[PDB]
Design a protein around this nucleic acid. Structure first.
Lengths: 180, 258
RNA sequence: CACACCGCCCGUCGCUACUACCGAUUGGAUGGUUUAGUGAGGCCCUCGGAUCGGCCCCGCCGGGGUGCCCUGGCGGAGCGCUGAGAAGACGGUCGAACUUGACUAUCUAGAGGAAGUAAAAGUCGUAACAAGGUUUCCGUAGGUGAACCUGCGGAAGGAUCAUUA
RNA sequence: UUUUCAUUAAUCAAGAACGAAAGUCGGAGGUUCGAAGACGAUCAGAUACCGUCGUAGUUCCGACCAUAAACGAUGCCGACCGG
RNA sequence: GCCGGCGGCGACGACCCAUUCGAACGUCUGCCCUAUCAACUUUCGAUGGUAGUCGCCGUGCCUACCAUGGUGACCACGGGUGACGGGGAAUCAGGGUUCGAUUCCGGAGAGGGAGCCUGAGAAACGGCUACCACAUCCAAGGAAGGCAGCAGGCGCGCAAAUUACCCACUCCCGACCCGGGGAGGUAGUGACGAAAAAUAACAAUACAGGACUCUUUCGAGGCCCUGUAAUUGGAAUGAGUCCACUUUAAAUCCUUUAACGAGGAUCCAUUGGAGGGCAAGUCUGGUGCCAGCAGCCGCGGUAAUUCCAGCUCCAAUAGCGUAUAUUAAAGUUGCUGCAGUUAAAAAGCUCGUAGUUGGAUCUCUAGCGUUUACUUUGAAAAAAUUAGAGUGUUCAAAGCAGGCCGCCUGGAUACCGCAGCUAGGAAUAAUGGAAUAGGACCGCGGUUCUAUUUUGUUGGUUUUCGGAACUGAGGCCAUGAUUAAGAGGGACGGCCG
RNA sequence: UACCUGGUUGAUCCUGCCAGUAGCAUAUGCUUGUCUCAAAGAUUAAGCCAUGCAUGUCUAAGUACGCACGGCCGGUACAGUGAAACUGCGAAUGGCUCAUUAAAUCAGUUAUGGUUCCUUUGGUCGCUCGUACUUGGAUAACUGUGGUAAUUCUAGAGCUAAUACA
């Protein structure tokens, strides 16, 4: 006996057919558009979407007056409005089925850092985040797969320490300044 | 196995203590006493986890061994002593008195009482017997055997005992239209009024209880405790008035407060 | 048959490799049931009494009560009469384990015997697929180096859906 | 059938009756055909096909044997659907 | 301390009752394969009866005397299990299949059996006694053994870590705030497996580069893209080196942060493929049905799209091959959902017990109504796990925390086969309520006994009322049998083969 | 995500399996920068073990004449800390492993009105009509003499305690 938990979960599902043109293209488009590292990151978002869709599908089968369906449905919709893949108008359980991978990949910190014009390329954003230049609220995050909340969007600023923002020259600038 | 068990694994402890998984392998293991192991509360949990006074296990025995804590007006230094339903824990150092009442969601809540109310306690009579030259006897849910009871006290009635003495001040009969509380099963901690009982000979008697908010539920006779005469309680209630309000308005209340 | 009748293909016998079966050796090996006989150790019962105290009775004697009783020292012995009590012993019970026959699980070498599958340039014929040159096949019986042949009764999956008042 | 009984039925582990031809025991009789076998042909060889003979058998009575391409290669009971 | 006695506060004890922690015996329902296991058990207890014995008690637990029972095609009994049983795990449309030695619950055993002391609790093995198997010391007289606790070693094999440090945390034990604990915690070994995530980004140059505007073409641009440039440029930085902390029982790791640290940023990304299945080369050397590749089909015999290499390209990526058990694919085990004329397959044929299935029809007076199955509701049902609410672990797998300027919070909820309890419904499916009328419902005749009120209380007889079985009759029921299956048995009639 | 694709033929349509495809576990190959979480002598042999450790314990409150310490006050039985030993309790929990075990174990449900129970928590404890202002004997520890090659082996001799034994 030991005081440790063994609650570990797989976050991606591999495709049934390993080599298939039309599919490989579609995944590489997603990588190319949102500068993802490998196809695991696309399968991760497919798996999460699939689980949300399966939850919506298994909720639909219950009657419209059931307390459980009402409570669970509202909670799911609230969370998907909170994360920012829907709006208050389209907040019906039926519309959960009308989402896709694009909607979820748009909410990556990498994507938002590129879309707000902090970085000048989708590839630059991932590096900039990973190099500890970017911060949300007063918290320095270096996770490209940080899924940004709707209300947390309006402040992604450069971390104050950073050379780009804070105002402290790095190794290259220091070395060039000493030999200048 | 051979002889009685002495340990208790952490995950095997009863859920209403809310011990987390990672802190250790073992648990408190309430020692033998008036209340059952499954339905009691160790002082180590009450002090450390609920009142947030002690951090580690040593600080709890450092509190208790200095003899600052009484249970029902009697000093207990045993940190794993079982204090259960209606038991009054008294801290005369800081002048704080608590009665152990179950809350709505079915666990012992940190419900403070005035020092004037920490004088008596209500108790459900388990049996009634007589022996040795006929001095009749009574036995209650917290194992307090009392001699010469009032002959109007029958089985499943409630009695109010002054803690300084060991004598019955007043008693409540178990009849229709009396305020009761559930102490076992799905409906644990719900307060309501008796509507009727359905006697099943050679089996458990089932009672029907109507809540203050028009909610009607059933329960076994063994898991009933009369707390009030008519509708008026003889003790203070927890934060909520024992009203089981559902997840819908739980969310509405939580979001309304925000 | 499609490399197309210069086609395909059957069995005996022959060489090689790999499996399995049968088999005298009343074959060993391990393990489990048990007939019969023996019986370590504890536990129980009936005895037993190595030792260890106490009660006692006088010899030499102090004080108190009044020749006798209580009170303090010591040594002797009474199969005196009471308690404790170890070794050992008959009997009882649970009973490991041991000696000898019987029943039986699996593995296990074996002279010699008799099969199957794969190997494709071995040898002798050509049984089958065309009416395959004796239509083929089934059941059963007998006989031949081998495929097979023959009797008797069926089947068409035949080479005939039909043969005439 | 303007008779009777009134659900007594359907299909079936176990368990039963029958079951071509050949085949094995005892009895009867043996005309034809005819496994085995003896010859005569054909053949490179023929241990077969073709022909002459011929034992068991083919036939009957009493015991076994329980199999066939025992085939419509198609289980049985009930409803509906074209001439 | 109070006027020589009387006392307050505890601690050890204590026959017995209650209680808590249990434990032990039971009740009902539920388990894998096997008929090349069809009858088993009962001499020596099998099933039951009476009396005991023994035991903490109920009981064939055991003895005595009796009875002859008990279980079984609804699968007994026997054998097998690479069988500890559950909570669960993997996979997955719906149904299912497979695994579950392994951290929680229950059981069992300390090499194999057997017997027992002590104690509330043991048939205890880090207690003892004996035998069986192994084996240690020895002065040969005797003595001492038990890792399937933590390390570690040998063996076995395809298969598995350190003779480490600490009671600080979670708890346990003791006369006990103070002692001890290889329970447990913390490091070391660790590509069992799971989560996040490096190996570069931007700017400036030229393209017999691309798109957008002008010219019919040639040829014209700070509008937007581009690489196989070791071309040009500073900006950013974690890997490592190493102060100081913080973390910790003491350390480590992480987080924090001085100093150093990027131009083949040589601070170098691998493992498998490139004929089809199946994404990627009919490019160039070599070998010549030899060497080898190839899960399968096939490629190799002198121009090899497949072998050994070079170059190039594809796939997944800090991982990717290979082998083997298992799941989906497998509607190739078929309940949902498969086949059986010829592909593998309906018994040669009929009877027949068990098994399964079975035609219309019938609109409440504290006890009932004819009893179930079915269906809906209720209570009971350990957490962990799974689903799922809340919560920015920096995100996530997680965790059960946290949030506001002493406070306001949370630690929900759902599911939990079957069977057993509980209250409604009465369609559907079984069963029966009156047929030689001892049938229902009503008042009427008697036999025996009894209730325990009564003659103010008290003793003897006789009573009624309260309550039963047995009967001798009577009135009434609209008195009691549904139909007769294009279900089936049987009867009879004239034929038929 | 309720999925299929190659392979019998000169070609076709089938039945049918072999092969491919993805997941999960054990092994193993080659490769291996950062960080968190984390299984791990189960399968074969419940086969066999050197060595070290894993169960001990004292409060004001059962027994203190060990100078092992110094301290009063010196006619004060016992100032205190306290080794050792007697006494009390624990060692039947925990941990390990899966050989056994097929209505057995075990799971859900009920019963003890048929039984035991240390401990805790309550009740009870002059309810009995018959030397007490404290009774008796020993043995550890300690001292002293020993035996055996040998073990957590122990005999003999001299004192002394009780909440031990009476």
């Amino acid at each position: 006996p030991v005081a440790r938990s063994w609650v570990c979960r797989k976050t991606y599902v591999t495709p049934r057919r390993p080599f298939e043109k039309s599919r490989l293209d579609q995944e590489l488009k997603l990588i190319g558009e949102y500068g993802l590292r490998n196809k695991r990151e696309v399968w991760r978002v497919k798996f999460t979407l699939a689980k949300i869709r399966k939850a919506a599908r298994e909720l639909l089968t219950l009657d419209e007056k059931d307390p459980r369906r009402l409570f669970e449905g509202n909670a799911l919709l609230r969370r998907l409005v909170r994360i920012g893949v829907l709006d208050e108008g389209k907040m019906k359980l039926d519309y959960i089925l009308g989402l896709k991978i694009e909607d979820f990949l748009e909410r990556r910190l990498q994507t938002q850092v590129f879309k707000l014009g902090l970085a000048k390329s989708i590839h630059h954003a991932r590096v900039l985040i990973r190099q500890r230049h970017i911060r949300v609220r007063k918290q320095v995050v270096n996770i490209p797969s940080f899924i940004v909340r709707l209300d947390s969007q309006k402040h992604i600023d450069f971390s104050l320490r950073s050379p780009y923002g804070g105002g402290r020259p790095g190794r290259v600038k220091r070395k060039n300044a000493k030999k200048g | 196995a051979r002889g009685p068990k002495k340990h208790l694994k952490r995950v095997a402890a009863p859920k209403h203590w809310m011990l987390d998984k990672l802190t250790g392998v073992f648990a408190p293991r309430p020692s033998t006493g008036p209340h059952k192991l499954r339905e009691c509360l160790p002082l180590i949990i009450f002090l450390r986890n609920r009142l947030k006074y002690a951090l580690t296990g040593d600080e709890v025995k450092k509190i208790c061994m200095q003899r600052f804590i009484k249970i029902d007006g009697k000093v207990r230094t045993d940190i794993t002593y079982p204090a259960g339903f209606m038991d009054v824990i008294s801290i005369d150092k800081t002048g704080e008195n608590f009665r152990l009442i179950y809350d709505t969601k079915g666990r012992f809540a940190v419900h403070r009482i005035t020092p004037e109310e920490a004088k008596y306690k209500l108790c459900k009579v388990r049996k009634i017997f007589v022996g040795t030259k006929g001095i009749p006897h009574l036995v209650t849910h917290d194992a307090r055997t009392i001699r010469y009871p009032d002959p109007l006290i029958k089985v499943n009635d409630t009695i109010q005992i002054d803690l300084e003495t060991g004598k019955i001040t007043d008693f409540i009969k178990f009849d229709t239209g009396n305020l009761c509380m559930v102490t076992g099963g799905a409906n644990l901690g719900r307060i309501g009024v008796i509507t009727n009982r359905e006697r099943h000979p050679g089996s458990f008697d089932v009672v029907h209880v109507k809540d203050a908010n028009g909610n009607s539920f059933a329960t076994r006779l063994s898991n009933i405790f009369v707390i009030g005469k008519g509708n008026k309680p003889w003790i203070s209630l927890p934060r909520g008035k024992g009203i089981r309000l559902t997840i819908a308005e739980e969310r509405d209340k939580r979001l309304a407060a925000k």
